[PDB]
């Protein structure tokens, strides 16, 4: 089968700047009828893929001519003359010249914006949960940029690595930031044996760890 290689894997571009994606194939895609069946698709976050270009350089209806396609043989390029927020997603090249049809691995395009410091919120276990004999402490780190961030949990000054569950959102198309959730789960008994619970983050926006904590007790 034809192997399709896309580069780069990810590109970060500021709104207004140009962007170009490359696609290379293991066999020439020139069909025996002289036509080259190379297509480009875009899959927006939470959406089905959509064809942008067909026959190397022909735009599909409803597609902005900010998008351009070119190439021949085994080398193809997709160019975005001016990036807009709606361009965020994964771009794929797919060939239909040789059977079976094969896709490239994808290139994620991410909008580069000004650094944004995380807004951190911490939540102790609910009563409902404690009743069940469990205790989860949750920490939300919302709206930060760049995506790169490191979060550690500390209980009474010691790092806790077991029982941590992390999740991140994709880049938000409203402000180009990222958000993440970190959940630490313990038994009710152990939770009731410690005092301070700390959610600690490391991010470009600060020379020192970003902290959020609470001391459980009673009254």
């Amino acid at each position: 089968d034809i192997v399709m290689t896309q580069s780069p894997l990810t590109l970060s571009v500021t709104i207004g700047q140009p962007a170009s994606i490359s696609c290379k194939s293991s066999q020439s895609l020139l069909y025996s009828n002289g036509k080259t069946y190379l297509n480009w698709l875009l899959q927006r976050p939470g959406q089905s893929p959509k064809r942008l270009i067909h026959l190397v350089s022909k735009l599909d209806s409803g597609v902005p001519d900010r998008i351009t396609g070119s190439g021949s043989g085994t080398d193809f390029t997709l160019k975005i003359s001016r990036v807009e927020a709606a361009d965020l997603g994964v771009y794929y090249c797919v060939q239909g010249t040789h059977f079976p049809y094969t896709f490239g691995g994808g290139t994620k395009l991410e909008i580069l914006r000004g650094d944004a410091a995380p807004t951190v919120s911490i939540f102790p276990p609910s009563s409902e949960q404690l009743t069940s004999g469990g205790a989860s402490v949750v920490c939300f780190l919302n709206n930060f940029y760049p995506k790169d961030i490191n979060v550690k949990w500390k209980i009474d000054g010691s790092e806790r690595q077991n029982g941590v569950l992390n999740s991140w959102t994709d880049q938000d198309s409203k402000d180009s930031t990222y958000s993440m959730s970190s959940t630490l789960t313990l038994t009710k008994d152990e939770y009731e044996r410690h005092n301070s619970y700390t959610c600690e983050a490391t991010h470009k926006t600060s020379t020192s760890p970003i902290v959020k904590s609470f001391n459980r007790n009673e009254c």
């Binding site: 919120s121 911490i122 939540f123 276990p125 609910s126 409902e128 069940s132 989860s136 920490c139 959020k212």
Partner: peptide
Amino acid sequence: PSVYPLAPVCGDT
């Protein structure tokens, strides 16, 4: 699933 509400204490912003 078990659904648990998260009300602020420090995560009050």
